């Protein structure tokens, strides 16, 4: 399980990749 805070709006949400 991996998650990153993206720089694309709206805001910097988290996406769990892998």
């Amino acid at each position: 399980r991996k998650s990153i805070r993206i720089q694309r709006g709206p805001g910097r949400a988290f996406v769990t990749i892998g």
Partner: antibody
Amino acid sequence: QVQLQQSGAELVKPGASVKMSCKASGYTFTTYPIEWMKQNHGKSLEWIGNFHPYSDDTNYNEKFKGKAKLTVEKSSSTVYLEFSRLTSDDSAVYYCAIHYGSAYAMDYWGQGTSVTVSS
Amino acid sequence: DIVLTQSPASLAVSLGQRATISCKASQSVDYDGDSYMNWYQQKPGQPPKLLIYAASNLESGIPARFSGSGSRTDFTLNIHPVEEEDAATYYCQQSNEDPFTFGSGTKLEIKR
């Protein structure tokens, strides 16, 4: 713990290129994208852009797109802010703040950095 | 882009009186049931502290006296108990659409 120890207190000259460095100790970096805010004198903040170490993606401002090159240094967890052709009207207080806590605004800002122009 | 035309940039508020820093936006900065409007408290020679985020979602760190009432474009910073700690300039940065920008600012000068 985490902290953004940035350094950029230089007396830039009209037509110079100073390369700043915002270090991130106790940081994940790739997960925490960094944004820069330019405060020309005692005025409001101006979001100049952002950066992502994971995908190496940036979002510069339509006015400063290309002038500010954000170099990647995942090895030292530091993002370089190479300001090229700095004009006399570029005296501002930069801040490399990120959205460490909430995913809306930045909570951990830089440790204060200002570039003064000789002329 | 969105213009954050805030209310009277400079004003005086005595200790105890409530302040009203309304940040009006030209465009809708709201999302799916979540507004993206942040407020910072840039103290004299100090980085802008993240007071409120997501329109009215208090930032874990500051007291429960920094309320935020705003929908779409009409936003406001309701600071009922204006203590001495409110001696800083408040800015409203919209993070809904690019490019992200801040507001004119509001140098809140407390009064003894």
